[PDB]
């Protein structure tokens, strides 16, 4: 079960979600065909 | 407990079946193995389990009572009625005499049941399962006579019309019986019989079943047979039988009351049955007057004798079996722990019957019979059935009748009735052995008259068994039929063959007309795109969906596994799934709406120039891709089209995937990729395709390297490097499926001899009608039949007459009526136009070749078989020789340079298309089963594009661009692996036909023309259509079953 | 019925499993052993009583 692992990090997941929503960051990498050089 | 027992279904336990009203009807009329077995097991459990302890207690009590009476047993008391010290030995000898007839009958009936039920529930060297026969106790086999009638063409004897023709009613039957009796010096019948008895009760109470009853009020003037007389042949026979009982009563009613009831239990039934059988003879019936004309044949005689055999010979083992078990139980030789063991030993030994389910000592299968609980001896019926034929033979010998015994009669044979009266008047005064010796001259019971009566049927049965090579008896006495799959819950499934044939006939009849109307409506909408035509097409689509739902739901009640056939089994299997019609009404409406929306937003999409001009795909965007050699123009067209079409389709695609997956799951498949791969009926299709592609890889790699070198020569080094992929737009298609078919950049060596197929068509007067005619002429010359003449003047192949010409690309159309083979494609005039024309004529000829097939099989052996058959001839035509024969000039193989040039041109097509075809369809399979998620649709598409093909996106792509949605087949939701398979096997077909053409040489330039043998070989395998699995037709065409 | 044993493999009328016993082909009666087994204990009990 991965549920215990998710419960361990739940405060962090909540804070990360709040921070990402505030910063307006799109989850994932919807520019997959991108390389730095 | 016996009366009140009932069997109830696993669900809906509200009301449930009883024995006499319900269980008898199902166990006599039904032919479903699961239903018959459910009824048999349910009744036997229900009536037997709660009857064992009572029977043990009753056995002990009865034995003790009769031991106090003097007999050692209850069975000893029962046997004491016949007063024969060796009764059991006599019965065993009788059965050993009757064994050959029963063995022949048993083998014949087992063969018929094996034909009907298949060699899994019934084997030909072994017992017959108990439920499969007519009765619940396998007692009599009349209800099985439907499948066992010998030469059923001759109608069975009956005078069912003649009683309505002339007034007979009920009173006259007893009058003719009485006068027949008086025609034998038998004593007349007293007047108290006439009005004091009962014949029909209008309103005086609710009568008893009144099947048979003769009454013997012990006052010497009272005699009644309450019968509820009807007007039927068997009713007349039973009238004679009951009147024979009454005549017995009256003639022997002189001795004291103790010396009554006949010589032994079994004389009464025998005495009645002698007259009952002698009255049903056609000669006596004609002499009475109920049979106007006397036709004659041995076939009706065999039919009658076999019905009699099924009635009586099938019972005789059972009658002896029932009392043998009861004697064993009473004597103590069977403790209350070998009840079922000894019962089933006897059942297998004497009757040759096998239990359908595994039994053991908790069961009491003997208690299911009526006579075991309601304690009544049973050997009287065995004895009576033997004595009846003994008496009949003796009477006919005295009557002077010479000939077959079953046709004898004693009417107007008063001389033969004297000894009948002499035996009859004895009553119970003398032992029955002496009475029998008086009547026949024999002391004990014999089976010789019984075997003499059944001589014709037994001779016919022996001949039929010897011809069929059957083994008499049942070796493999241990064999037991296997339990049906999902037996407790799959009982209400129709597995009858006649019902399946009726369903397939009705489905063909209604589907033919509805699909013909759909074909007309599709043609009209195709050539006349408008509002009214679109509305009528939509209403016909709704009608066809409703019809398909109805008939598929009807066919889902059948059990395709238990049907014993190939054609109807295939039809029911095919129609059992619902083409998206399994979805609920709301879901089906949403699915149709989303499919229409995707098709629409792909069809009307256009990419607009910055200056304002807008370009559609089919007219000019394809052309600006094929004809332009500028990197920026090609990139603009490619990117614009992919962007517009894909971003339009991406909004709808995930919902469509979910809905199609749901429908294909409701149809019994898995995730709608299995549904699409199941058209090929190969469980290992994916591995075969991968192996074929791996075989094809080196040639494609060499061609890709050469084309990349040429494109680097033209476009320079900035746009193409010699190590790495080529951009997807520098090839000649919007999808690079048939790349560099525009091959002026990659031509191997531009020699002076070079035909111009595109220019030759314009230079010559090759109208579309005349080139289509030339294709038809070549097709006919190959050895295949021509198209009906109205095809030319009925189909359209030039131009439209509406605002939109056609959809981007479509195929040929068949109307399923055996008369219309329309064609639709029109693309001005070109070489590609010629090859597409030949492909579509191949399609039409495939459509027409299986016109004689049923509609459900009117589909083609494989989805790729259609294209392969259409395109093998097109491949043959494109050769330099056959193009030379038809308005062109080509040196063919004389100049190896021109041959290599032609091979390269033919390779830039049909290669680089194989990777693309497998690529797009493989991507779709991985999307349908959840391997590819909505997040990385484009990522996985371009990974497959780089892996199988060698292409890279000319411009960076992102998630949110739905590049796979730019193909037509992705939003239209049509499978694509058919094109890969067809391109693989069309060369197999070309090789096979060239081999049959009589020469091989350079296969790449061999052509089929006036090769009637190859055309016949193709026709003999194209005509099976879908009636047989694909490998059979592939082997017929080629010999090698697989790709 | 008496011994309470089953064939490990399925048999049919082709087989003749009664002939595998020595006494069946070599025709010798066999109930003398049953009778003797029953009788010897009767003799023993009577002798012990006497
Ligand atoms: C049944 O019908 C028969 C005739 O089919 C009736 O009996 C005859 O009735 C007719 C009337 O015209 C008389 O002439 C005959 O003499 C009668 N007897 C015979 C033997 O034909 C009879 O009454 C009817 N029975 C019932 C119970 O309704
Ligand atoms: C129909 O034909 C059969 C023969 O197929 C007749 O049977 C004959 O019966 C007479 C006495 O009635 C015997 O003497 C003959 O020897 C029989 N023939 C054979 C071949 O066995 C029968 O009588 C005919 N009529 C009817 C009404 O069945
Ligand atoms: C069982 O299948 C066979 C063929 O495998 C059927 O035989 C033909 O079936 C077609 C299609 O229904 C009929 O038009 C023909 O009349 C059949 N021919 C014969 C000689 O019967 C057969 O009908 C199928 N069985 C049933 C009960 O439908
Ligand atoms: C009796 O059973 C035996 C043993 O199962 C049968 O012999 C087998 O028969 C099958 C069917 O033909 C063959 O495939 C096997 O190879 C046979 N085995 C041997 C060892 O011979 C036998 O046929 C059965 N006999 C009868 C009369 O039913
Ligand atoms: C096509 O539809 C139009 C509707 O205006 C009608 O006039 C025309 O006859 C139709 N053509 C055919 C071939 O049915
Ligand atoms: C299809 O049949 C059902 C049967 O209940 C009917 O209610 C429905 O209206 C039919 N559909 C159409 C489009 O007529």
Residue numbers in the entry:
A (entry chain B): 1164 to 1200
B (entry chain A): 121 to 1163
C (entry chain B): 469 to 518
Study authors write:
Angiotensin-I converting enzyme (ACE) is an M2 clan zinc metalloprotease (EC3.4.15.1) located on the plasma membrane and in the extracellular milieu. ACE is a 180 kDa heavily N-linked glycosylated type 1 transmembrane protein with two homologous catalytic domains residing at the N- and C-terminal ends (ACE-N and ACE-C) in its extracellular region.
Therefore, we collaborated with the National Center for CryoEM Access and Training (NCCAT) to prepare sACE grids using Chameleon. From these data, we obtained a map for a consensus ACE structure that achieved a resolution of 2.8 Å. We thus performed 3D classification and reconstructed three distinct conformational states of full-length apo-ACE at resolutions of 2.99 Å, 3.05 Å, and 3.15 Å. We refer to these ACE dimer structures by their resolutions, namely sACE-2.99, sACE-3.05, and sACE-3.15, along with the structure from data obtained using the Vitrobot, sACE-3.65. Our sACE-2.99 and sACE-3.65 structures are globally similar, both contain sACE-N domains in the open and intermediate states and sACE-C domains in the closed and intermediate states. When sACE-2.99 B/A chains are aligned with sACE-3.05 A/B chains, three domains are well-aligned, and the remaining one depicts the open-closed transition of sACE catalytic domain.
